[PDB]
Symmetry: C2
Subunit: 176 residues, 2 copies
């Protein structure tokens, strides 16, 4: 049996989650990011979500949940998902007022870093969900939500999913 | 305020997680799941995963997360992600000794229920990560991992992903 080892991963997730919600800053960043997408939507814009390998699944669902909750009477798609692979999609499909939503457990994903630069060069606000110390994109995005974890991606990927879920239902209230 | 709402979702996830890890049965189920798959692996088997939105990504994470860690010197693919769509796939690519990994927050997803039936008919073991009361999936899977929470999907999906991460690491040890 591996009761203790298995529970330890679970208790670690608990510790990580605690450190995250106890800090008012993250709670505020969570609110800022949802306020951005709302405003963009209210001005017709859209959200482009990109996630670095194994994190792109989250980026991909977030876009789906947004399109399946706001397509109703509204042209286009509110949320679309996808080293220059992401930055080429920004230039290609992004417009002023749109938002970039990128996930990177470390703050060092090159394809997402460039994605952020392209958004800036397109009049697009940026939101980055990161881990550790925010890595190289720390401070680069308009709004950064950082998970206080310096170990493997798992605990971080897990908190990103909670953030995404919370952000989505705030947007609904934002839209009201 | 509005942030107190953000914190209430987070602490709600804190509660659900705490409840989940406080039941030794849940922990034993996690071990029985990784054991099943590991055994399958040791006889040339593979895991077929599936879920419906939100759970589609989890099914996707698990499979690709499996291939990366057990592709070395193993023919084929250790893991593959997918009302009769899932069941038709099991019938076509599934084989005796294989494992069906299904996720359904409610436990009543018809396509996954079909998938389970085909799995049995194929001589395949089945694992199901559920929530709420276990739905119809309870008593059907060879191993059920139920998140102790009766409510929307968010809290459950959030624990399902935690389970997946843990299961992946447990396969390394459960078969090393």
């Amino acid at each position: 049996m591996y009761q203790d080892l298995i529970r330890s991963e679970l208790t670690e997730a608990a510790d990580v989650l605690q450190k995250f919600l106890s800090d008012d800053h993250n709670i505020a960043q969570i609110e800022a990011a949802a306020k951005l997408i709302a405003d963009s939507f209210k001005q017709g814009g859209k959200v482009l979500s990109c996630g670095n390998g194994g994190s792109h699944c989250d980026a991909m669902h977030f876009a789906e949940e947004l399109t399946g909750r706001y397509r109703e009477n509204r042209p286009g798609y509110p949320g679309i998902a996808i080293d220059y692979v992401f930055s080429r999609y920004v230039e290609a499909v992004g417009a002023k007022g749109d938002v970039l939503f990128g996930l990177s457990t470390s703050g060092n994903s090159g394809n997402i870093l460039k994605a952020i630069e392209a958004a800036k060069a397109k009049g697009m606000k940026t939101i980055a969900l990161t881990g550790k110390d925010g890595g190289k994109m720390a401070g680069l995005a308009d709004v950064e939500i950082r998970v206080p974890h310096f170990g493997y991606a798992d605990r971080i990927q897990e908190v990103h999913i909670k953030i995404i879920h919370i952000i989505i239902q705030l947007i609904e209230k934002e839209m009201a």
